[PDB]
Design a protein around this ligand. Structure first.
Ligand SMILES: [Mg+2]
Ligand SMILES: [Mg+2]
Ligand SMILES: [Mg+2]
Ligand SMILES: [Mg+2]
Ligand SMILES: [Zn+2]
Ligand SMILES: [Zn+2]
Ligand SMILES: [Zn+2]
Length: 87
RNA sequence: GCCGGCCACACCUACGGGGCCUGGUUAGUACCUGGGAAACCUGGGAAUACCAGGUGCCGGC
């Protein structure tokens, strides 16, 4: 079991993630921080972070070998297909 | 509708779904950090698979 002692909170958690997450109430800082260089962004849960990292991740065009495009955002990857590959 | 913000719940589809997100389980496990003679303890912590629903909101002409 995982128990916090913030201020004798007591609260007992099964997984140490549930714990950390719970430190939002006490204090305030959003627990989950971002590892990418120069990205002062923080989040509430860990799932919400995993999804954010998909940003710094890429969005590579896999519509054909000849094409080796890599957009910076989903929107951009879409515009790419919107023009470069029609019909 | 166009644009922009967010960066797929936004996308594709033989229209059956696929993909993606979300919440449980796999799993506090496999596995690395490090302490230890060791039992264990400390801090991180998957993959894979499976169940349960959801599928674009905001701002400007
Ligand atoms: Mg940073
Ligand atoms: Mg748009
Ligand atoms: Mg441990
Ligand atoms: Mg509008
Ligand atoms: Zn607490
Ligand atoms: Zn970031
Ligand atoms: Zn392409």
């Amino acid at each position: 079991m995982y128990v916090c002692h913030f201020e004798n909170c007591g609260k007992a958690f099964k997984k140490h993630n549930q714990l950390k997450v719970h430190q939002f109430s006490h204090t305030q800082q959003l627990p989950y921080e971002c590892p990418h260089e120069g990205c002062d962004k923080r989040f509430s849960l860990p799932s919400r972070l995993k999804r954010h990292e998909k940003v710094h991740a890429g969005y590579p065009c896999k519509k054909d070998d000849s094409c080796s495009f890599v957009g910076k955002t989903w929107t951009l990857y879409l515009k790419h297909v919107a023009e470069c590959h029609q019909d």
